[PDB]
């Protein structure tokens, strides 16, 4: 259970986001159904009145919390990957428009998975804005906590992979568009009941053998980390 505060780019606190950049559900529940319209942007899908201005080579991050700003960030139960896509927001969200600039799940050095690390990182990931079209585009990131995750929602809808997905309204305003952007994913319909990552036992299976799901991380993409890059104590 964990929602976006708001982003900081190039390291500076751009504000509280919650409904005003930040398509922000009412609370920090989870989406368990992947067929879905709650998967696009969770399940108050709608223009909020601001949209971040960015240039490419930026850094974009994400901050997240549980109850309050900078608190324990989501239960440490919670184990699982992290991704942030991509869309222009002329799509809503819909049809094969999501690129994935971003893909963390388990680092055997540390033992640590994604969320293990957000927590550590007072609830931060960022990308890089990539080499785009200049426009209105929708970041959305994805927190899959795999604690329920041996069975499928489909089958059980009392357990399943829990997804905590947050849209960005974001306006990439100086870019060369070299990089344009490729065919997408949509969302739902990405991930199925098959789709490696979605059904895992993190109690039985090695973490080193978890797969994440498709698709992979776009090559156009710069992206990006889990770390800290502001003190929001300091405000
Ligand atoms: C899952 O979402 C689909 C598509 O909206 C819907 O038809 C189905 O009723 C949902 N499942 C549950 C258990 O609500
Ligand atoms: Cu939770």
């Given at each position: 259970h964990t929602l976006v505060w708001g982003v900081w780019v190039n390291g500076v606190d751009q504000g509280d986001g919650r409904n005003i950049y930040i398509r922000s559900p009412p609370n920090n529940n989870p989406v368990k159904n992947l067929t879905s319209p709650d998967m696009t942007c969770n399940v108050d899908?709608?223009?909020?009145?601001?949209?971040?201005?960015?240039?490419?080579?930026?850094?974009?991050?994400?901050?997240?919390?549980?109850?309050?700003?900078?608190?324990?960030?989501?239960?440490?139960?919670?184990?699982?990957?992290?991704?942030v896509y991509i869309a222009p927001a002329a799509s809503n969200g819909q049809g094969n428009v999501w690129?994935?600039?971003?893909?963390?799940?388990?680092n055997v050095t540390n033992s640590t998975w994604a969320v293990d690390r957000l927590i550590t990182a007072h609830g931060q990931h960022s990308?890089?804005?990539?080499?785009?079209?200049?426009?209105?585009?929708?970041?959305?990131?994805?927190?899959?906590?795999?604690?329920?995750?041996?069975?499928?929602?489909?089958?059980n809808p009392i357990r399943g992979?829990?997804?905590?997905?947050?849209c960005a309204q974001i306006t990439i305003n100086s870019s060369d568009d070299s990089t344009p952007l490729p065919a997408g994913v949509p969302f739902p319909g990405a991930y199925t009941d098959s789709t490696?990552?979605?059904?895992?036992?993190?109690?039985?299976t090695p973490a080193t053998s978890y797969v994440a799901p498709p698709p992979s991380v776009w090559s156009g993409a710069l992206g990006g980390s889990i770390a800290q890059v502001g003190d929001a104590s300091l405000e």
């Open positions: 899908n709608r223009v909020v009145p601001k949209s971040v201005p960015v240039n490419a080579g930026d850094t974009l991050t994400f901050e997240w919390y549980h109850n309050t700003r900078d608190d324990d960030i989501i239960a440490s139960s919670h184990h699982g990957p992290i991704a690129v994935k600039l971003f893909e963390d799940a388990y990308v890089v804005v990539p080499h785009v079209a200049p426009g209105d585009y929708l970041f959305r990131a994805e927190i899959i906590a795999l604690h329920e995750a041996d069975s499928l929602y489909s089958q992979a829990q997804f905590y997905i947050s490696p990552g979605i059904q895992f036992n993190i109690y039985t």
